[PDB]
Ligand binder design. Structure first.
Ligand SMILES: O=[N+]([O-])c1ccc(O)cc1F
Ligand SMILES: O=[N+]([O-])c1ccc(O)cc1F
Lengths: 127, 127
């Protein structure tokens, strides 16, 4: 891939959510640039690089069942960026919660995620 | 208002949509900082300041039948930012159409919008 087109961004971002839903940590990490950053939630310091990003996804998706689904269409740009709304369902203390999130991503000139920013706060959690 | 809290961001960003929906250009412009920027769509160069911003809203809201509604919750941060998904219904050449958008906003230390970025492309328009 080169810089993804708007259409390619929609496909990549939807792919990403599919990978989160099934919980394929290694497949998620490979979507990222080797030196990518993740800010989760937006407002917290970034994490840097695939090792730290893999640890992030392992922490969240490693154990119990997690589901994730788009809750509206991906909004893509013509500069390799996009934003998408989704919901993550998880068990927290035997307690089924849901978290509503919007991710903003920028992709590099190879089609990998260079930056991810996850907008949400505790008000977006529901038990 | 100081830097808005996550709850305050949710209220402001929801109010913004209510004002787009009712078509109140002056009330929208008043929500922006005097030297704010708007990037619409994200990927295009920013416009700057209340005069340019007012001209943007007036193009669309002055006389057109326009409705706008959140299509999911506002995702707020603890650093005065947020992101929200919504749909704008408008009329184009006598055709009803809908545009799916995500706005990302950063508010200043006075509770006014410092930056707005509207993610969407042609793939988000339905005629
Ligand atoms: O559950 N999260 O905090 C979460 C945040 C952003 C993501 O892109 C995926 C996720 F699972
Ligand atoms: O129709 N738009 O392009 C549009 C974009 C962003 C907005 O905050 C409002 C709008 F009506």
């Amino acid at each position: 891939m080169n810089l993804p087109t708007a259409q390619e961004v929609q496909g990549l971002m939807a792919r990403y959510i599919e990978l989160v839903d099934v919980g394929d940590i290694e497949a998620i990490v490979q979507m990222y640039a080797d030196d990518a950053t993740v800010e989760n939630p937006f407002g917290q310091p970034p994490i840097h690089g695939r090792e730290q990003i893999a640890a992030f996804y392992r922490q969240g998706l490693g154990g119990g069942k997690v589901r994730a689904c788009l809750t509206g269409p991906v909004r893509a740009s013509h500069n390799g960026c996009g934003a998408m709304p989704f919901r993550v369902e998880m068990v927290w203390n035997g307690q089924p919660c849901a978290l509503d999130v919007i991710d903003v991503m920028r992709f590099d000139e190879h089609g990998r995620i260079q930056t991810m920013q996850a907008y949400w706060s505790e008000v977006n959690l529901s038990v």
